[PDB]
Curated annotation (Swiss-Prot), chain A:
CDD domains recorded: TM_PBP2
Species of origin: Escherichia coli (strain K12)
InterPro entries: BP-dep_ABC_trans_perm, MetI-like, MetI-like_sf
Known function: Part of the ABC transporter complex MalEFGK involved in maltose/maltodextrin import. Probably responsible for the translocation of the substrate across the membrane.
Protein location: Cell inner membrane
Record topological domains on the Periplasmic side: 112-117, 193-226
Organismal lineage: Bacteria, Pseudomonadati, Pseudomonadota, Gammaproteobacteria, Enterobacterales
Ranges that cross the membrane: 17-37, 49-69, 91-111, 118-138, 172-192, 227-247
Cytoplasmic domain ranges by topology: 1-16, 70-90, 139-171
Stated name of the protein: Maltose/maltodextrin transport system permease protein MalG
Any one Pfam family match given in the protein's UniProt record, by short name: BPD_transp_1
MF-aspect GO terms: ABC-type maltose transporter activity
Main location per the UniProt record: membrane
Swiss-Prot record, chain B:
UniProt-recorded name of the protein: Maltose/maltodextrin transport system permease protein MalF
Domain spans labelled ABC transmembrane type-1: 83-307
Any Gene Ontology biological process: maltose transport
PROSITE patterns, alphabetized: ABC_TM1
Phenotype for residue 182 to C/S: No growth on maltose
Any one annotated GO CC term: maltose transport complex
Gene3D superfamilies for this protein: D-maltodextrin-binding protein, MBP (2.40.430.10), MalF N-terminal region-like (3.10.650.10), MetI-like (1.10.3720.10)
Cytoplasmic side: 109-120, 195-227, 308-316
Name of the gene encoding the protein in the UniProt record: malF
Membrane topology summary: Multi-pass membrane protein
Family: Belongs to the binding-protein-dependent transport system permease family. MalFG subfamily.
Predominant location: membrane
From Swiss-Prot, chain C:
Keyword Amino-acid biosynthesis belongs to the record: no
Gene that produces this protein: malK
Entry-linked SUPFAM superfamilies: MOP-like, P-loop containing nucleoside triphosphate hydrolases
UniProt subunit comment: The complex is composed of two ATP-binding proteins (MalK), two transmembrane proteins (MalG and MalF) and a solute-binding protein (MalE). Protein stability and stable complex formation require YidC.
Source taxonomy: Bacteria, Pseudomonadati, Pseudomonadota, Gammaproteobacteria, Enterobacterales
Catalytic activity, reaction form: D-maltose(out) + ATP + H2O = D-maltose(in) + ADP + phosphate + H(+)
Effect of residue 116 to M: Suppressor of EAA loop mutations in MalFG
The protein's name in its UniProt record: Maltose/maltodextrin import ATP-binding protein MalK
Amino acid sequence: MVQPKSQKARLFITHLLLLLFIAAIMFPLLMVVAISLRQRITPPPFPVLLWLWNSVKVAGISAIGIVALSTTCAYAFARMRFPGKATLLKGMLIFQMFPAVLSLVALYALFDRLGEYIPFIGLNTHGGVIFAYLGGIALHVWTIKGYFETIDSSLEEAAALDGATPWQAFRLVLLPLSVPILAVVFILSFIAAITEVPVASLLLRDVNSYTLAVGMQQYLNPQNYLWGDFAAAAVMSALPITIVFLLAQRWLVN
Amino acid sequence: LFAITTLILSSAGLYIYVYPGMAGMGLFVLFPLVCTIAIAFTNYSSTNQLTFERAQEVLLDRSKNFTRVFTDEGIQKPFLAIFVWTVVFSLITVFLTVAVGMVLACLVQWEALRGKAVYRVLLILPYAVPSFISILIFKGLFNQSFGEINMMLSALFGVKPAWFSDPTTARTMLIIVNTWLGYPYMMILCMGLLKAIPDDLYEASAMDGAGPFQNFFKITLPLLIKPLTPLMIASFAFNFNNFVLIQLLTNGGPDRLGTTTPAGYTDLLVNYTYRIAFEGGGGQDFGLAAAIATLIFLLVGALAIVNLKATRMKFD
Amino acid sequence: ASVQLQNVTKAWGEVVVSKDINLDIHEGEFVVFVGPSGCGKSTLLRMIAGLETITSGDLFIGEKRMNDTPPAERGVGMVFQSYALYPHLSVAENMSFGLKLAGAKKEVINQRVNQVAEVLQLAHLLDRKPKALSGGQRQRVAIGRTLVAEPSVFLLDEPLSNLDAALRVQMRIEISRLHKRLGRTMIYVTHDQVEAMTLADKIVVLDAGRVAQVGKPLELYHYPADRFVAGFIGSPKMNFLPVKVTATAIDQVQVELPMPNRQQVWLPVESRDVQVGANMSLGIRPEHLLPSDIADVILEGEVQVVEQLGNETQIHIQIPSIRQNLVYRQNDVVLVEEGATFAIGLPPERCHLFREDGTACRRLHKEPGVA
Amino acid sequence: ASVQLQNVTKAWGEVVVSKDINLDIHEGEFVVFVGPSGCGKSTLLRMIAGLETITSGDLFIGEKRMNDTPPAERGVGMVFQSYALYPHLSVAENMSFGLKLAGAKKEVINQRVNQVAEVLQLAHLLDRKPKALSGGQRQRVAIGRTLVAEPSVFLLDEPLSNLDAALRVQMRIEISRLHKRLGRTMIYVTHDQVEAMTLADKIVVLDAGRVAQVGKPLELYHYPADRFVAGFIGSPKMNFLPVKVTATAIDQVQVELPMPNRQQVWLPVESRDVQVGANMSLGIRPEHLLPSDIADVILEGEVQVVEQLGNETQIHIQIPSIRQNLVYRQNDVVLVEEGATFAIGLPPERCHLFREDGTACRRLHKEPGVAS
C-alpha cells in the first residue's frame, strides 16, 4: 500500500521497543548459559542423564496411546451416528478439562488397587504413568473429528462402491488422509508428557526411573553452586525442547 | 469402594462388547472424579481408609463427609483470603498474557517491520523450553539474597527487594512469571486467529484515515473479543487452578501466620487443598470435602459457560 | 441401460421436497435438468445413483428395481459439484482406482486410461496429484474417474459450473462427443440455459422439487408448459402482461390488451375451458416482438433502457398502463436515445397465454423443427 | 475530477506488470476497463485510488498529482472485490461509517444515509447486521458506504461480480441512473463484455498491463485495434483464417483463401503498410457471414456442430481445408443435420485483417452509429 505518512517514525519506535521486549524475556535463559558444568576431588551429583531418557520413554509411548485412543474412539463419534453422540462429547470436553487438583487423591487410591492385582502398571512405574494420562483424549477427539469432517464426503461414496468396509474406508482411504492431525496430536501429546509434574511425581517413588520432569526438581535445598548443576541440566533440557519445539515449527504449512 | 463400581459395570458390560472399551475411560478418568469429590472425606480424620473389617484383622491375628464443608465459619477463614488471591491471580494473569499475545501478534504480520519471521521464533521460545525447567531456574534467579536477580537490582537501582519474604511483592512474583510462561499461547492463538480478518477491510480504514493504533482499538481488537472469549475465560479456569507453578516457585511462602492447618498467602485454592492432605505431617485433616467439592463444582460453572459461547464454528 | 421413475418421493420428515415426481428415461438418452436454486435437482441425482433414499414411489435401471442395492451394483457413475477427487493419490492412480479395486487387470488399466487420459488432454499430468494442477484439469481428469471405469449410466451434478466460457463449451462437445460416441444414458444438473438446450436429448424444468415439464429443446422454448418455464428459459425473460379474453372458438381465443385503445386480437390457443371475461395473461418474447410497420398490432410506450451489444440491440420499454417494462431484441443496432418514444409489433401467431392458475394455453400454431 | 495518467508503470520488482500506459479521463466520464484475468486490471484501479504504488510515470485527479499521497486524501472511495463489509457493525452503523470517523454532526449523517438507503431499497434493513442478509443485500449496502461518503471519484473493482442473472442487470442500470443523475467521474472493471459495453462512456482493452486500445463500445466492435481486441468482444469469438495479400492499391487490398477456391477479392482496407506476398490473417464474425446464395464470396463446406440456441442457432463448419473450423450465427431456426454440406458468403466490408504481427488494417467501411 502507499504510506508517506511518517513511515520512518513508526518503524523505529516499533522496531526498537520490540528489541527491548525480546531482550528482557531472554535474560533468564541467558544466565542458564552463565553456567553449564555437568558430567580436591568431588564427583557424581544427582543423575539427570537417565532422567532425560525416561522422559522420552514416558512421553513417547504416552502419545501413542493418546492418538490410538483419540482417533479410534473418535471415529465412532464423527461418521457413525448413534445413541446420544452430541451429549457425551459435550460431556467429555467439559468433564475432563477439570483442574486436575486432587485428581491424584483418587488416583493414588486407585493405582494402589491396580498395582496389586495387575503388576507393572501399578504404582511406581512407567506404564502406570502412561495409563494415567490416557483420559486426555477429550480435548483431542474434538479436534480429530473436526478435521475429519472438513475433507469432502463422496470420496467415501465412490469407495463404499468398491467394498471399503468401515475400517478399509477408514484406514486405507480416510486415515492416511487425516494424518496431519495424527502428528499434531502425537507431537503435542509428547510435550505435555515431558512438561508433566503432578502425576509423574506422585506414582514414581524410585530415584532411578524419574523423568527429566521429576529429577531436576530436587535442586531446592542445596542452592548456591549446585543450582549451577541445574543450569547444565537446562542445557540438557534445551536439546529436546529447542529441537522438537523447532521441528514442529516448520509445520506452518501455508 | 472399587467392589461397588465393577458391580454395575459387570452387569452393564456383558449386557449391552461395547461397554468394556468405554469402561476404561469411565473407570480411569471418570471414576477417580467421583471418589475424589464424593469420598472427599468422611471418616478419614487420619484413621479409617479401612474399617471394622480390618479392626478384626489388626487385633485378632496378633499372633460425616461433606458436612465438614459448609458447616463452617470458625474453621472457615483461611479459605477466603486464598479465593480472593487465587481468583485475582487468574484475572490479572489472563489480562496480561493476552495484552501481550495479541499486541505481539498484530506487529508480527504488520508486513512493514520486515524480518517478522526471526522475531517470531524467539518470541515463542519461553514456551519452547518447558514451564517446568523454566520456572525452576526462575526461583534460582529470584532468591532474596541469592540470584543474580536482586543482584543487578541492588546494583543499578537503589533497593533489591523481598521476593520470597514479603507477601505483597511475592504475589507479583508469580503474575509476571506466568506472563513470561503464558504469553506464547495468546500470541499463537491470536497470530493464527488474527489472520482470518479481511485484509481489504483495513484498506477501508485507509480511505477514511486512521491507525495503526486506530486499527487495533477501533477495528481488529473489538473484533477478536468474541473469538478469544471461549478460550481466554476457560484458560482462566486453568490459571486459578494452577497447581504446579505455585509448588516449585514458592509453596505460597511466606506463610499467612494465623493458619491453624497448612495454609499460605500465595497459595492458590488448589495448593491449600493439596497441602492439608500431605506435604509433611500425617493426617492434619485428610478429608478435603469442602476443598474437593468447591473445586469440581465452581470450575464446572466455568465449564458450562465455556460450552455456551463456543460450539464448533465458522469458515471465516 | 434404460432407467425411469414412478411417483418417486422424499421427505426429510417434514421437509417433503420430492412430491410424487415421475419419468421414463430410455437407453441412449442424455437427459438434463434445470431449476432456480432450491432445485432439489441434486436430490434426484443421488436418488438415482444410490447416495440417498427412495422415500416413496419407485425406480429402476437395467430394468430391475434398485432402491435397495447400493450405488456400486448399478454401474452408475458421476462427478460432483465439488469435483470429487482423491487428494492423496495421483491422476494415474485416482482414475485407476475403481477398477484395480478387487481385480488388478493391469493391461486393461493402462490402455483404457492413457487412451482416455489423452483424450481429455491429460497424458503428461500422469504422475502429478490433485493440488498439482489448475482449476480446470481436476474437473477434467475427474470426469475421467467415471470415464476410465465405463459404467452404463452417467450422472453429472455440474462438473462445469465453476469455470470460464470456452472451457464450458469445448468440454460440452467433449461430452456430446463421447455420449454420441458411447451413447449410454446421461442425466445432468445445471443452469446454463445454453448447455441445457444444446446438449440434451430431453429435459426437465424442475420447480421446488416437481416435474414442471419435459420436452425436446425448442419444445421448451416455443411450446412452454406454464408461466414459470417460459419465463425461465432463453435470453431475457419472456416479457409479459395482463388481458381480458373477449371471445373464443375451439381453436382460436380472442384477447384485449389493457392499454387505452384496447387493441383486441386473435391467437391460435387451446380454448376448451376458457370462459370469457377471465383475467388471462399474454406471454411473448423479445426476439419475436416485431417493428412498427409489418404487423397490424401496434404497441406504443416509452424507452426505458438502450443496451448496445454490437451484434444487436435490445431497448427496454415501459409501455403505459402495465407494470412490466418491455425488453426488445432484434439483430443489428438502432440509434434511439433514451426516454424518447417508441413502439413495436405484436406478432399474434407466435404469441402465448396462460390461465390464472398459470397453466399452458397450448398454442395450436405449428412451427418448424417441431415434429 | 478530470482524472488522467501518463507513462504510469509498475513492476513488483522484476515483474513489470504495468507498462507506460496512458489515458485522459476528463470529468463526467465513466470509463471501464476489461480484459482476461491476470490482466491485473485490479492493479491499475488500485494505483489510481492509491491503495498500491505508483512505480513510474505519473497520474493526476484534475489539478493535482497524487502519486505521493495517502489513499484518503485524493477525495476517493470504492467498493472492493470482496465487498469490504464490517462483520461487526450493522447496516445502519456500517454505512454511516466514512462520515462518522473524520466528520461529526448526527443530523447530516442519518438523513444522508436514509436518503441513499431508500434508493438502495434498504430503508427497512437499517438496523439489521451484516452476516444477517442475502448475497445481494451485502453488495447493495456496500455500494452505499462509498456512496454516503461521496468521495468525488467512484472506483469499483468488480462489484456485481458474485450474482444472479437479473440482479447483475438491475444493480447495473441503477449504477447508470446514479452516474447520469450525479455526473461525477466513475471508473470500473469486470468481464461481462455486456456490462462493459452497457455502462461504457469509453474503455480500455488491457493486455498484460499494456494499453492495447481505447474507444467507444462500437468503435471497439466495428473498428477493432487488432486480433486480440476483436478476439475479445464477440459473442462467440470472431472467426479467422490465413491469407496471401495478392495485391493492393490506394484503398483496397486483395488477398485470397489457402485452398482450392483461389477466390482473391478486395476489402475496404487502410492499405497503408502492406507489402505483398504477406501471409496475413482474415478476420470476420458469424454476425456477418451471409447465406450461401446471395453474395459473391462463395464458401462451401461440411457442417461440424449445431448449437440450437432456440431464439437463434449457430453452426461450426469445416471448410475443405481451413485449419480450425468456421463459426455461424443467425436469427431463427435452421434445421441442418450434421455431416452434410453447407456454405455461405464472405461479404467484404464487414471484415478485418492484419499483419504477420497483429496490428490491424484500419477500415474504410463507414458502419452504423460510428461518427467517422
